[PDB]
Amino acid sequence: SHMNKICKILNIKYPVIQGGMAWVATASLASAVSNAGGLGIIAAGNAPKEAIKKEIVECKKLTDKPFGVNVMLMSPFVDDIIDLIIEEKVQVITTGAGNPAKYMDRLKEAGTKVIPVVPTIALAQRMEKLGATAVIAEGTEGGGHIGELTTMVLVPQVADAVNIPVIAAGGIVDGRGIAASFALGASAVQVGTRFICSEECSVHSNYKNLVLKAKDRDAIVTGRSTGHPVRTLKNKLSKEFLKMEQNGATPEELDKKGTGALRFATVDGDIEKGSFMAGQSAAMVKEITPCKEIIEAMVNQAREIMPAIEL
Amino acid sequence: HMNKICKILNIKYPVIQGGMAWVATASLASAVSNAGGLGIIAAGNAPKEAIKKEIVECKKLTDKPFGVNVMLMSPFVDDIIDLIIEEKVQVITTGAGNPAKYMDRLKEAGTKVIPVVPTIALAQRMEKLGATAVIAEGTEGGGHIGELTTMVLVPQVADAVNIPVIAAGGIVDGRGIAASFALGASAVQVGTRFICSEECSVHSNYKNLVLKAKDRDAIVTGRSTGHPVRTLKNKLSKEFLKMEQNGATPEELDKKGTGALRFATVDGDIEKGSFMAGQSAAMVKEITPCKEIIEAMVNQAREIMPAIEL
Numbered sequence: 001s002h003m004n005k006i007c008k009i010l011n012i013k014y015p016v017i018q019g020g021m022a023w024v025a026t027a028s029l030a031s032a033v034s035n036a037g038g039l040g041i042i043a044a045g046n047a048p049k050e051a052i053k054k055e056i057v058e059c060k061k062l063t064d065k066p067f068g069v070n071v072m073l074m075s076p077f078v079d080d081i082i083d084l085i086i087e088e089k090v091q092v093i094t095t096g097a098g099n100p101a102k103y104m105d106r107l108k109e110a111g112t113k114v115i116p117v118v119p120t121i122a123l124a125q126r127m128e129k130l131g132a133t134a135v136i137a138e139g140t141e142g143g144g145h146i147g148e149l150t151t152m153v154l155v156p157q158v159a160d161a162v163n164i165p166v167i168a169a170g171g172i173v174d175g176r177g178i179a180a181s182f183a184l185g186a187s188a189v190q191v192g193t194r195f196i197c198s199e200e201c202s203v204h205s206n207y208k209n210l211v212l213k214a215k216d217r218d219a220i221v222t223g224r225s226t227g228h229p230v231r232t233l234k235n236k237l238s239k240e241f242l243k244m245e246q247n248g249a250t251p252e253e254l255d256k257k258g259t260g261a262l263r264f265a266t267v268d269g270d271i272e273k274g275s276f277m278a279g280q281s282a283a284m285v286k287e288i289t290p291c292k293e294i295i296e297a298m299v300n301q302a303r304e305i306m307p308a309i310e311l
Numbered sequence: 312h313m314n315k316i317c318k319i320l321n322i323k324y325p326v327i328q329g330g331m332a333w334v335a336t337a338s339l340a341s342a343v344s345n346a347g348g349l350g351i352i353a354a355g356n357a358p359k360e361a362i363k364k365e366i367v368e369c370k371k372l373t374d375k376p377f378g379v380n381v382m383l384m385s386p387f388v389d390d391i392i393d394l395i396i397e398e399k400v401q402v403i404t405t406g407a408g409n410p411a412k413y414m415d416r417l418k419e420a421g422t423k424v425i426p427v428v429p430t431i432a433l434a435q436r437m438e439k440l441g442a443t444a445v446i447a448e449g450t451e452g453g454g455h456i457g458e459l460t461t462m463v464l465v466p467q468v469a470d471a472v473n474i475p476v477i478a479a480g481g482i483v484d485g486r487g488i489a490a491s492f493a494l495g496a497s498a499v500q501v502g503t504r505f506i507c508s509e510e511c512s513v514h515s516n517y518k519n520l521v522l523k524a525k526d527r528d529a530i531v532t533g534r535s536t537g538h539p540v541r542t543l544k545n546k547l548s549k550e551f552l553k554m555e556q557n558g559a560t561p562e563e564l565d566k567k568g569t570g571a572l573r574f575a576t577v578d579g580d581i582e583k584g585s586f587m588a589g590q591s592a593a594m595v596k597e598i599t600p601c602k603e604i605i606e607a608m609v610n611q612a613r614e615i616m617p618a619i620e621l
C-alpha cells in the first residue's frame with residue numbers, strides 16, 4: 001500500500017528509467033543507472049543480434065540490479081533482437097518507433113515485462129489490451145524520432161485512457177519534471193537527454209559538451225517534410241540537412257547525408273558530421289554528473305516540490 | 312493572498328483566462344473575473360472603438376479585476392495602447408511580439424504588464440523593462456504558437472527571472488495547475504478550455520469542434536511562412552496544408568486564410584472557419600460555467616498537491 005507501482009513491478013528502488021537511446025545507451029550507462037537504483041536500458045537501435053548480446057553480457061557483469069533492453073522496432077534485426085531478449089532472459093524491454101503487437105504473446109509467455117512507447121491514445125489502449133506492463137507517453141519535446149503531442153497533454157490523456165502505469169518521457173531533466181509528471185498522472189519517468197551528460201555514458205565528450213552548450217531553441221526538427229520528424233541539436237549537419245529538405249533534395253540525397261550521422265556523434269564526436277540527437281531538455285542540462293548523483297538529486301527534489309508524491 | 316499572483320492582481324484564484332482573438336469578449340472575461348480568476352478581453356486585430364465597447368460592457372458586468380490582451384501584430388496596436396492607458400486598464404497581457412517600445416508609457420501609467428514570452432531572452436528582457444510577470448506559453452497552446460513545450464519552457468523561464476511566471480499551453484484542469492506549479496509557475500493561463508464555457512460567446516459549432524476534438528486534431532499550419540498556427544483539423548485547415556504541400560506561396564496562403572477565424576467564431580462555418588485551439592482541445596469534454604471550471608481546477612490541484620501555494 002502507498003508503494004510506487006513501477007518500483008514494485010520492476011523491483012527497482014526509484015521510478016526513474018534511463019531511456020533506450022540508439023548508439024548512446026550502452027552497458028556503461030545502463031549498469032550505472034541500475035546500480036543507482038533506477039532502470040538502465042541497453043539500446044538495440046539498428047545493431048545486429050551479436051552486438052547487443054555483447055552489451056547484455058557486459059551489463060550483467062557490471063550490475064546485479066534489474067535492467068532492460070529497448071527494441072527499436074524499425075531495426076532490420078528486430079526479429080533477432082526479440083529472439084535475443086527471450087534467449088537472454090531479459091526481465092523488461094521497452095519498445096519504440098512502432099507497434100510491437102506481433103511479439104507481445106511470445107514476450108508475455110516468456111515472462112518479459114513489456115513497456116512500449118506510445119504517441120497516441122489508441123496505441124496506448126491497444127498496448128494495454130495486448131498485455132503491456134506499462135506504457136511510456138513520450139512528448140514531442142524528447143530527442144530522436146518524435147511524436148506530435150507534448151508531454152503536458154499526452155501524459156494525462158494516456159493516464160485517462162489506460163489502467164496500467166504510465167511513464168512520462170520528453171523534457172524531464174530534474175525533480176521538477178518528475179513532480180510535474182506525477183501530477184499529470186504518471187507513475188514513473190523516462191529520461192534520455194539528461195543521461196547523455198552522465199559520467200558513465202560512453203558517447204564522445206564532444207556530444208556531452210554540445211548538450212551542455214545547448215540553448216533554449218537549439219533542439220530543432222528535421223524530417224517534417226516526410227513522415228518521421230527527428231529532433232536533434234543545431235550544428236552544421238542538421239542545418240544543412242534541413243536546408244536540403246526545404247530545397248527538395250531527393251530521398252536518396254538525404255539518405256547519404258544522414259547515413260551514420262548519429263554514430264559520427266557518439267563515436268567520433270564529429271561536430272560537423274554528427275547528428276547530436278537531444279530533446280528540448282538539452283537546454284536545461286548544465287553539468288556532467290554520475291548517474292547516482294543525478295537520480296538521488298532527482299528524487300529528493302521531486303519530494304521537496306511535491307511531498308505527496310508516490311515514489 | 313499568499314499566492315504571489317493573487318496578491319499582485321487582487322484576485323481570488325491564480326487562474327487567468329487567456330486573451331483569445333475574436334473569442335474572448337466581455338461575456339467570457341466578466342464571467343471569469345466574477346468567478347475569482349482574471350478575465351481578459353482580447354484586442355486581437357480589432358480597431359480602438361470595437362475594443363473600447365468591450366471594456367465598457369465588461370465594467371457593467373463585473374467589478375472584479377480584469378485585463379486586456381494587446382496583440383502586438385495588430386494594425387491598430389498603437390491605438391490599443393492608447394486605449395489601455397486612457398481607460399486606466401489595471402493589467403494587460405501582450406502576445407505575438409516584443410512590447411519594449413511601450414514599457415515606459417505603460418509603467419508611468421501604472422499599468423501592470425504581463426507579456427507572453429516564448430524564449431529565455433525575451434523573458435529576461437521583459438523583466439528588465441519592468442514586466443509585472445511573464446506568461447510562458449508552450450507550443451501545445453492554440454493560435455500563433457512558439458516552438459518550446461510547456462514542460463521545458465516554464466522551468467527555464469522560472470530559472471531566468473525573479474518575477475512570477477504564469478504557465479500557459481495545455482492546461483485544462485487541476486493536473487495541469489499542479490504540474491505547472493511543480494515547474495515553477497505561480498499561476499496558469501488557460502485558453503482552449505474556456506472556449507467550452509457557457510459564457511464564451513463563440514458560435515455553438517466552435518464549442519462542438521473543441522468538445523469532439525481527438526488527440527491529434529490540433530494541427531499546425533503555416534510552418535512554411537514562419538508564422539505557425541495551431542488549429543483544429545477541418546476542410547479549411549486540411550486545404551491550407553494541401554496548399555503548402557503543393558508549394559503554395561505566402562500570398563496565396565494569406566488570401567486563403569483571410570477572415571477565417573471570424574468565420575469560426577461568428578458564423579461557426581465548419582468548412583470555412585479556422586478553429587484555433589490547443590492540443591488541450593482533446594481533453595475538453597464538457598461545456599461548463601466558468602465558476603465551475605475554475606473551482607473544480609483549484610480543488611483538484613489542491614487534492615493532487617496538498618501543499619500547493621494557490
Ligand SMILES: Cc1cc2nc3c(=O)[nH]c(=O)nc-3n(C[C@H](O)[C@H](O)[C@H](O)COP(=O)(O)O)c2cc1C
Binds near residue numbers: 142172
Ligand atoms: C539520441 C537519442 C536516441 C534515442 N533512441 C531511441 C531508441 O532507439 N528507441 C526508443 O524507443 N527511443 C529512443 N529515444 C527516445 C528516448 O528513449 C527517450 O524517450 C527520450 O530521450 C526522452 O526525452 P528526453 O530526451 O527529453 O529526456 C532516443 C532519444 C535520444 C535523445
Ligand SMILES: Cc1cc2nc3c(=O)[nH]c(=O)nc-3n(C[C@H](O)[C@H](O)[C@H](O)COP(=O)(O)O)c2cc1C
Binds near residue numbers: 354427588
Ligand atoms: C483561438 C485563440 C486565440 C488566441 N488569441 C491570442 C491573442 O490574440 N493574443 C495572445 O497573446 N494570445 C492569444 N491566444 C493564446 C491564449 O491566450 C493562450 O495563451 C493559449 O490558448 C493557452 O493555451 P491553451 O489553449 O492550451 O489553454 C489565443 C489562443 C487561441 C486558442
Ligand SMILES: CS(=O)(=O)c1ccc2nc(NC(=O)Cc3csc(-n4cccc4)n3)sc2c1
Binds near residue numbers: 147
Ligand atoms: C537506430 S536510429 O539511429 O536510427 C534511432 C535514433 C533515434 C531514435 N529515436 C527513437 N524514438 C522512439 O522510438 C520513441 C518514440 C517516439 S514516438 C514513437 N512511436 C511511434 C509509433 C509507435 C511509437 N516512438 S527510435 C530511434 C532510432
Ligand SMILES: CS(=O)(=O)c1ccc2nc(NC(=O)Cc3csc(-n4cccc4)n3)sc2c1
Binds near residue numbers: 448456
Ligand atoms: C488577431 S488574430 O486573429 O490574427 C490572432 C489569432 C490567434 C493569435 N494567437 C496569438 N498567440 C499569442 O500572441 C501568444 C504567443 C505565443 S508565442 C508569442 N510571442 C512570440 C514573440 C513574442 C511573443 N506570443 S496572437 C493571435 C492573433
Ligand code: NA
Binds near residue numbers: 138142143144145146
Ligand atoms: Na524519441
Ligand code: NA
Binds near residue numbers: 213
Ligand atoms: Na544546456
Ligand code: NA
Binds near residue numbers: 448452453454456
Ligand atoms: Na498562441
Ligand code: NA
Binds near residue numbers: 521522523592593
Ligand atoms: Na475533446
